[PDB]
Amino acid sequence: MTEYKLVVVGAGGVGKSALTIQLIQNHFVDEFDPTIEDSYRKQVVIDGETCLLDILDTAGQEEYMRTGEGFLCVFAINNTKSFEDIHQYREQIKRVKDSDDVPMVLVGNKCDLAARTVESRQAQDLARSYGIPYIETSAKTRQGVEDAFYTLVREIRQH
Ligand SMILES: Nc1nc2c(ncn2[C@@H]2O[C@H](COP(=O)(O)OP(=O)(O)NP(=O)(O)O)[C@@H](O)[C@H]2O)c(=O)[nH]1
Ligand SMILES: [Ca+2]
Ligand SMILES: [Mg+2]
Numbered sequence: 001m002t003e004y005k006l007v008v009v010g011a012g013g014v015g016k017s018a019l020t021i022q023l024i025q026n027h028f029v030d031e032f033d034p035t036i037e038d039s040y041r042k043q044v045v046i047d048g049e050t051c052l053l054d055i056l057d058t059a060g061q062e063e064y065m066r067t068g069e070g071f072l073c074v075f076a077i078n079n080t081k082s083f084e085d086i087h088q089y090r091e092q093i094k095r096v097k098d099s100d101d102v103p104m105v106l107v108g109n110k111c112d113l114a115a116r117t118v119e120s121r122q123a124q125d126l127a128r129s130y131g132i133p134y135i136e137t138s139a140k141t142r143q144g145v146e147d148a149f150y151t152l153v154r155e156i157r158q159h
Contacts, residue, residue, distance in 0.1 A: 001043075002051040004153050005067060009089045010074030011082040012060030015109040018139035019074065020057045023149050028140045035059050046153055053149070066096050070103040070152045075123075077108045077136065078115040083123065090130060103155035104132045107148050112138035 008016045017032050024040045038057045043050065058065060073089050075082040086106070094100055106127040108118065120136065127134035133151055137144035 002049065003054055004051060004156055005054045005056070005069040006072060006149065006152055007056045007058060007065050007068035007070070008072045008074060009058050009065070009093070010060055010072075010107075011079070011085050012062075014060060014074045014076040014079060014082050015137075015139045016060060016072075016074050017057055019072075019107070019109060019137060019145060019148070020055055022139040022142060022145050024053075024055065028142075034061050036064060046150055051153075053153075055149075065093075068097075070105075070156045072105055072107050072148060072152055074107045074109055075118065076110045077118050077123075078110055078113050080117045083108075083118045083126075086126065101159075103152060103159050104130070105148055105152045105155065106130070106132055106134045108134065108136040110138060110140075111136040111143060112141045 008020055010016055017035055018029050021029055024042050035057055036059055040055045042053050044053055071093055075086055093102055108123050124134050135144050135148045137148050
């Protein structure tokens with residue numbers, strides 16, 4: 001059956017692991033270990049297609065992807081530095097993949113928190129400059145989580 005190899009990248013502590021665990025295990029982790037590299041595999045139904053999601057959860061911490069088919073580029077809406085650092089991760093992707101045309105979604109996580117320091121308009125403008133969708137998420141409330149992963153699946157489908 002069809003398998004979508006997704007890779008989740010972004011700065012440390014933005015909620016990459018929490019988002020992944022919320023999609024795959026359907027619960028929120030309040031306290032998680034920084035990642036070296038972890039992978040999750042799950043059979044799902046998306047738009048009437050039964051498929052398998054292989055998600056690679058990568059390290060955000062600097063102390064640390066090529067087979068990836070689609071990329072979730074994650075920042076946290078209450079972490080300006082993570083947003084300012086997004087261009088880096090897009091660059092490495094275009095680099096390792098050898099393409100300016102790679103399925104990718106920009107994700108603004110922790111949208112449940114009220115200490116927003118990155119405005120939606122700014123992230124939208126960035127996403128449009130890359131030619132990609134922008135989706136805001138909360139791994140805590142599950143807001144936008146399916147939207148983000150499923151949009152990525154659909155971007156891979158269109159490619
Ligand atoms: N309120 C809230 N907290 C969140 C959300 N996502 C993650 N967190 C919290 O943020 C912390 C770090 O999340 P984590 O998933 O470990 O981040 P990471 O990007 O995987 N880290 P690393 O890059 O080091 O592997 C955890 O305490 C987690 O509960 C979210 O959407 N909302
Ligand atoms: Ca595939
Ligand atoms: Mg992690």
